[PDB]
Ligand binder design. Sequence first.
Ligand SMILES: Nc1ncnc2c1ncn2[C@@H]1O[C@H](COP(=O)(O)OP(=O)(O)OP(=O)(O)O)[C@@H](O)[C@H]1O
Ligand SMILES: [Mg+2]
Length: 829
Amino acid sequence: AVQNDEVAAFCQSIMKLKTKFPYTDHCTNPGYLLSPVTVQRNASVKVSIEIEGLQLPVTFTCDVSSTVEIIIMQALCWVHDDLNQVDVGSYILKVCGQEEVLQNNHCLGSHEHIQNCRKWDTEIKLQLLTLSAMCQNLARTAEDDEAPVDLNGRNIKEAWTATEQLQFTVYAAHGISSNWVSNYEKYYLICSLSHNGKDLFKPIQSKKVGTYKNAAYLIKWDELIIFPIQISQLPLESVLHLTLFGVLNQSKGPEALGKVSLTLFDFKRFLTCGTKLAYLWTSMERIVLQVDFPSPAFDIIYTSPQIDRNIIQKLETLESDIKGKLLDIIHRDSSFGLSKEDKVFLWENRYYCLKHPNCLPKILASAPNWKWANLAKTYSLLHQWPPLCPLAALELLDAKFADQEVRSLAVSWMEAISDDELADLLPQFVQALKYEIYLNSSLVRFLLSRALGNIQIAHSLYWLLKDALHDTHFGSRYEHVLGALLSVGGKGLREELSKQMKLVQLLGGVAEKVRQASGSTRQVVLQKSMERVQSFFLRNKCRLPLKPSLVAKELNIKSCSFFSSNAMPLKVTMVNADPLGEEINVMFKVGEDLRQDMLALQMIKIMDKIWLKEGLDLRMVIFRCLSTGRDRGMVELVPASDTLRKIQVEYGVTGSFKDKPLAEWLRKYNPSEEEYEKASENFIYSCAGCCVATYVLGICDRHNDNIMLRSTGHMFHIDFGKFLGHAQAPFVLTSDMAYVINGGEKPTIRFQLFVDLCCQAYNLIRKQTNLFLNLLSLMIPSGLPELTSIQDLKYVRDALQPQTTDAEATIFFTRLIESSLGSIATKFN
Ligand SMILES: Nc1ncnc2c1ncn2[C@@H]1O[C@H](COP(=O)(O)OP(=O)(O)OP(=O)(O)O)[C@@H](O)[C@H]1O
Ligand SMILES: [Mg+2]
């Protein structure tokens, strides 16, 4: 009745968000993916541009710092004597093979594709063309704009006056299973009342009751629950949690069967009255739980406290000894280990901190309470507060800040963030929706707005929301959000996402068919199971879900295979629809949850962004991984790369040195002195980044199989089964690795560089301790093995040592490296 009205009101606001995004505005409706950029502190590069009319592409050297706009008319100056009548605004640059367009107002160096090519030393192949020739099949139409949002596939009393006690009678649970009446004797509910993800009072337990007489489908309590709180004392974003328990029969402890969460105030600030039905899920099973709230002759509405139109100016009383203690906690890493006496102090001296905006999350966490009376003073500060850094504002979208005025203000500051930065943070933003109690929020409208204006964000949101549907508690919410995204995306995007969904469903079928057969059968099973994928590609041309810029037209069946390890992963080899492009090699794995692999890769990618933004390039391998369902997805295959194991055993056959397996492997593919030197250098930098990442994220499962090495010399992790396992040498540097770093059997200045890079990097991550703790905090509700409590964050905070300064931290990590060497540590200084 009110929930169907909330869905109706959501749709109407989404219908008027669509009005801001007409199909005519190419800016927000291009029809193509933008090649992603990560701003880098600014070097020459050779680029190979294909031009219409020319049979050979023009190859010239560009300044890395120079903008794509001038590189486009550098390429036009090569073909045309004078560009007075060529229409320079007509033209764009796209990556050869990949349906992604370079951003005209960004440096060539900024683009991820240019950064990657430079690292591998591969040829930068671009194509000069006009948006007329550029594929715009994903573009929204006039039909999509005019189309409505479907989303599917009298007397009032103000709350602050309401002295009535919060009470409700848990009536009954309906439709219990046959295996429930089998196992459990009696059932009881535990009722808890929370705000800012924290209990207001201890949870009240219901009486233990069996199934109702002559009705084994029904549990009837009909018990009145009374909390020791008035309606006036309830914050707006108050939530009632009901967990059902079942005591087992003598044929252990009581088992948690399911959870339910009711908002005491609805989306129009009216207190929940009369009978309300909530649905808890178990096994595909739908259990209806009835809660009867009081129903007086009047509706109780929440009204915010009258605004405090106050400006605190600028002359304030200054004490010098408090100034020291205040700026000490203002420049503290985070609000994590902040003690009670530190909070009361900051809260008292909060109005002195107005020239350090990024310390607001420390102030709001220091608040004594969120009582109705004490909200006026909080809103007064908030609405006169300077704008926060988007990455700082992330903390205000966590569980511990449920207030709508804080969250709505956090999202308003967030609008300052770029699409390219947001794109890599989307998983945390999707989880943050769980802390929005109302369907229609500032956060969901923000995400839908960016999804409309950027096809890479919309594409990423699709797969993240599709994974979030499997949440038993929040699957209902994400259903409505994904329906809003798909509806607003348009026919073009929808029809393409459907082709991607069918491909993964077919790749899923073959993947589990392959693992379910015998060794002799497997090769024949794959070749026959891939015929249904061969059929798919002859009626459809599909974009790779992992990287939707790549369009596959056909499968290279004879090149397709399996990796012959645990889970028997597939090696899907597709041919590019673009002849200018190259073969598409991806892995599809089934059985393993690839979300914790996704988080590890994300954290390593953010580390790389932080380093590159401070001018430190550790030449890191950043490969993609996407979860396309429950315990299945596809992983980017890094080309010309093997595990340290295979390299150590294959050159332990030929050599009895067991000191130069990695060295003689790199010399095989890098024979010239300068080629081996650049390969050894690539190793030093990539190894330093891996050692830092290994320690901070806590990955002790780094052995010869789990570490991989590219032929160019770049080291990178592949397995992330162990992650945040700080329950323990953290990383290991073998005699093989040391020999490559030194460039000899004795220590050189190249090891001092490796040590300098490690410590320098370690400190640049310590500077962003708050971001990492916030990004890992927001992924807690995802439900990943070893990221469940807030104590799991402390382990990462301890690794980052925010207490120490860069001097002491350098000494610590330098002793980590000396410990890492172990046996051969004696040789070094
Ligand atoms: N991102 C990648 N790029 C290139 N090759 C990869 C990548 N990920 C895995 N591989 C290759 O695929 C092989 C099998 O991968 P898989 O994930 O099954 O290995 P694992 O998790 O280390 O081992 P297991 O699954 O048997 O416990 C690896 O040994 C490696 O050679
Ligand atoms: Mg694995």
